[PDB]
């Protein structure tokens, strides 16, 4: 597998709740591309779920400040804090804060990664945002528009098909890829 394909397999694995085969996938990303923080923020989103929050916070605090990946684990910092039994709710709005702060001067990436986490929750309408402003930033980034076409066919309603269908399209004619074509897919069974 390409490393958009292992970081896709992983998405999906988290929407079934498959926290072990998250783990399996997240260290081959780590040992085929130990370089890349967004392998090793999965591997501790894996342990939080698995239930080793404490292994997961101290797995996060290692990556937290690297700038493709800083919103993603601040908000599942969020996540860990509100999972376990004693929430820091203080710790919480300290995250939410450097959230909200990030979040003002973020790059692409950043933003690619907020709205997809934010998507494993299904949190549609927040990802959206971030999606957003990556497209605005990007000044019309392929990804952003696959993912604004993607979060189109997540909230369901009819119209906006047309115009995800037409988002993938364009987003294909630069080279396939596995998420714009599921997308067109998808736009294909929902009509």
């Known amino acids: 597998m390409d490393s958009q394909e292992l970081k896709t397999l992983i998405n999906y694995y988290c929407q079934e709740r498959y926290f072990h085969h998250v783990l399996l996938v997240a ?3 780590i040992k085929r591309y130990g370089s890349d923080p967004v392998f ?5 989103y894996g342990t939080l779920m698995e239930g080793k929050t404490q292994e997961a916070l101290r797995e996060f605090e290692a990556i937290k400040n690297k700038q493709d990946v800083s ?11 509100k999972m376990s039994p004693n929430p820091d709710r203080e710790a919480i709005l300290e995250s939410d804060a450097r959230v909200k702060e990030q979040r003002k001067g973020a790059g692409e990436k950043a933003l690619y990664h907020a709205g997809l ?18 497209i605005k930033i990007s000044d ?6 696959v993912l604004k076409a993607w979060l189109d066919i997540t909230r369901g309603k009819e119209p906006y098909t047309k115009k995800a269908l037409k988002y993938f399209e364009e987003g294909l004619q630069d080279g396939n890829d596995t998420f714009a074509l599921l997308g067109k897919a998808q736009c294909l069974e929902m009509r």
Do not use: N
């Not at 019309?140 to 528009?145: E, M, P, T, V």
């Open 117 to 134: 986490f934010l998507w494993h929750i299904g949190r549609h309408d927040k990802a959206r945002e971030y999606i957003d402003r990556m």
């Open 27 to 29: 260290s081959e990303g």
């Open 40 to 44: 090793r923020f999965y591997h501790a």
């Open 140 to 145: 019309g980034s392929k990804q952003g528009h």
């Open 71 to 81: 919103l993603c684990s601040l908000l599942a910092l969020i996540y860990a804090h």
